[PDB]
Amino acid sequence: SYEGGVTAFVIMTCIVAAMGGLLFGYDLGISGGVTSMEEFLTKFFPQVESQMKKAKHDTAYCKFDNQMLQLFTSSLYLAALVASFMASVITRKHGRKVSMFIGGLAFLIGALFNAFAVNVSMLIIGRLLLGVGVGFANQSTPVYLSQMAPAKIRGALNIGFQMAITIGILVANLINYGTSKMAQHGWRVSLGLAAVPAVVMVIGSFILPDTPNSMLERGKNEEAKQMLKKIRGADNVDHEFQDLIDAVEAAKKVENPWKNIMESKYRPALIFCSAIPFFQQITGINVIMFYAPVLFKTLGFGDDAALMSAVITGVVNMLSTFVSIYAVNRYGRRLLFLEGGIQMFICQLLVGSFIGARFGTSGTGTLTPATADWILAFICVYVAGFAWSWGPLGWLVPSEICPLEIRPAGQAINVSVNMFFTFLIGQFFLTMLCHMKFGLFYFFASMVAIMTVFIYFLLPETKGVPIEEMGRVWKQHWFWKKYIP
Numbered sequence: 001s002y003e004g005g006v007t008a009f010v011i012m013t014c015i016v017a018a019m020g021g022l023l024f025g026y027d028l029g030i031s032g033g034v035t036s037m038e039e040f041l042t043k044f045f046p047q048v049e050s051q052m053k054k055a056k057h058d059t060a061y062c063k064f065d066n067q068m069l070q071l072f073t074s075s076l077y078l079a080a081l082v083a084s085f086m087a088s089v090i091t092r093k094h095g096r097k098v099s100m101f102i103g104g105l106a107f108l109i110g111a112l113f114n115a116f117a118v119n120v121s122m123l124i125i126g127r128l129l130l131g132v133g134v135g136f137a138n139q140s141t142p143v144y145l146s147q148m149a150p151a152k153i154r155g156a157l158n159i160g161f162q163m164a165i166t167i168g169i170l171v172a173n174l175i176n177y178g179t180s181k182m183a184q185h186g187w188r189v190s191l192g193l194a195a196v197p198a199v200v201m202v203i204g205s206f207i208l209p210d211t212p213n214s215m216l217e218r219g220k221n222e223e224a225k226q227m228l229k230k231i232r233g234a235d236n237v238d239h240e241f242q243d244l245i246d247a248v249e250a251a252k253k254v255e256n257p258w259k260n261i262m263e264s265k266y267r268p269a270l271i272f273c274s275a276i277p278f279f280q281q282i283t284g285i286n287v288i289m290f291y292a293p294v295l296f297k298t299l300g301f302g303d304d305a306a307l308m309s310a311v312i313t314g315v316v317n318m319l320s321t322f323v324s325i326y327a328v329n330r331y332g333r334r335l336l337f338l339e340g341g342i343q344m345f346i347c348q349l350l351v352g353s354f355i356g357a358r359f360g361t362s363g364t365g366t367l368t369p370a371t372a373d374w375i376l377a378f379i380c381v382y383v384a385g386f387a388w389s390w391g392p393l394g395w396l397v398p399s400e401i402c403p404l405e406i407r408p409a410g411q412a413i414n415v416s417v418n419m420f421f422t423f424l425i426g427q428f429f430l431t432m433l434c435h436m437k438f439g440l441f442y443f444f445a446s447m448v449a450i451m452t453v454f455i456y457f458l459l460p461e462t463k464g465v466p467i468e469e470m471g472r473v474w475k476q477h478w479f480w481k482k483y484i485p
């Protein structure tokens, strides 16, 4: 019943949001392919590529175990973790669009720092800057886009952002496959192409307006409704406008969500706002996402085949994220948590044992065409199972079970421990693979068993139930009944 359709304002916001999502996915998916390139390894980590062919030909589990090489991947997420708090502050004091702008600018400057890197300190300075971009943009871009979108197609545009991210992953994989055949400086093109959507984002981010919600929260109702009318193209926006003032009056009268978050009425949610992210990262999904090319390279794929296999993981992640829309709205959260968990579990066991039967505990041995094919196939079945379970639900259900009196705290801790464990995966996958050998896949498998047991016994169905009623579904539960008075 909100009047107002598609305007040039929402086209602009959608250009900027698409650029931001593509940037997320691209900077996530480019690092692994570039780490697998022997030009890049020669120029920044020579001690690593010496230990791979003539010297140390078969030592599969530890060829790439170097803390600086993995810092190249992880520093982005370290910086994103810290920059999310900084973006919280700057969105409050100045505005969400300012954080959008700062994130786009960080994307641009860091992409250029990466492309022009003549030493390793430049390299991870650029990565830290891309992380600053992620920290400022993941905050600002989605809720700016949702505020700007007409209520009718709002969900469609948010789903568009969501899949902009995964298609960006696939785009980065493809760019890596392509630039790897450049005779020189292909990794530069790979890391640097991020600068194009980054400057589209910088420009659009600068010219776009403060949202009517923002003007309402800083007391400019007069400007707010005029801007709402101009952004909607409808000649009266009263129904939407006073729902916005209701929302901002409600948000204003909550004192502090951090003291409410740890009162017992909300401690199921708090538990799940801490357990869901950890679990999502201890699945081992970013093993694949960050390090699929170098994993295939340690097992003896060959550069070309490793990059192509990363491309197929990207294709499967994209298609399965497509079906995850239909999946999360046809089936319940418990069903898909359980199904995806057992799928990932079977695949992790199988992959770990193929690798163990070919290389043992000493890292010496040969892959076979059939075992290489099976390892890739079950990696992909694994990421497909993740892509319609712990992937989307790992953000969906923490927001779902969080009333507005607790939602800022809930999403703060959600994103921060998710980012911290993302960082740990990126910083320690290769050294864990060295110390645990093929047993690391068994470790990830047993932790997925643990998290699925956790979901089966502790999280009740939250699909289709309203926020104001989650309380009841929480004390119908045999265990959480302990916490609601």
Ligand SMILES: CCCCCCC(CCCCCC)(CO[C@H]1O[C@@H](CO)[C@H](O)[C@@H](O)[C@@H]1O)CO[C@H]1O[C@@H](CO)[C@H](O)[C@@H](O)[C@@H]1O
Residues within 6 Å of the ligand: 090, 093, 094, 095, 096, 097, 098, 101, 205, 206, 210
């Ligand atoms: C800590 C790091 C630096 C922060 C700089 C913030 C930036 C420029 C951002 C870049 C330009 C925009 C992409 C926002 O500047 C603009 O922000 C707009 C909100 O979006 C306001 O509508 C506008 O009035 C303001 O000038 C300038 O700060 C201003 O913030 C105002 C309060 O927001 C202050 O009243 C003002 O003393 C201050 O000088």
Ligand SMILES: CCCCCCC(CCCCCC)(CO[C@H]1O[C@@H](CO)[C@H](O)[C@@H](O)[C@@H]1O)CO[C@H]1O[C@@H](CO)[C@H](O)[C@@H](O)[C@@H]1O
Residues within 6 Å of the ligand: 024, 025, 028, 080, 081, 084, 134, 135, 138, 142, 158, 161, 162, 163, 165, 321, 324, 325, 387, 391, 392, 393, 395, 399, 415, 419
């Ligand atoms: C380098 C980032 C890679 C992706 C990481 C997950 C990420 C991106 C930001 C992560 C936080 C960074 C500090 C994509 O979001 C999800 O989109 C789903 C769509 O089906 C996918 O299935 C799922 O795998 C993916 O995690 C989560 O989305 C963020 O932005 C909003 C989107 O609208 C969400 O409203 C918000 O709360 C969430 O914070």
Ligand SMILES: OC[C@H]1O[C@@H](O)[C@H](O)[C@@H](O)[C@@H]1O
Residues within 6 Å of the ligand: 028, 166, 280, 285, 286, 289, 317, 390, 391, 392, 394, 422
């Ligand atoms: O597709 C891979 C991505 O899936 C998302 O659900 C996770 O939040 C990210 O950490 C991961 O990189």
Ligand SMILES: [Cl-]
Residues within 6 Å of the ligand: 095, 096, 097, 144, 209, 210, 211, 214
């Ligand atoms: Cl704004």
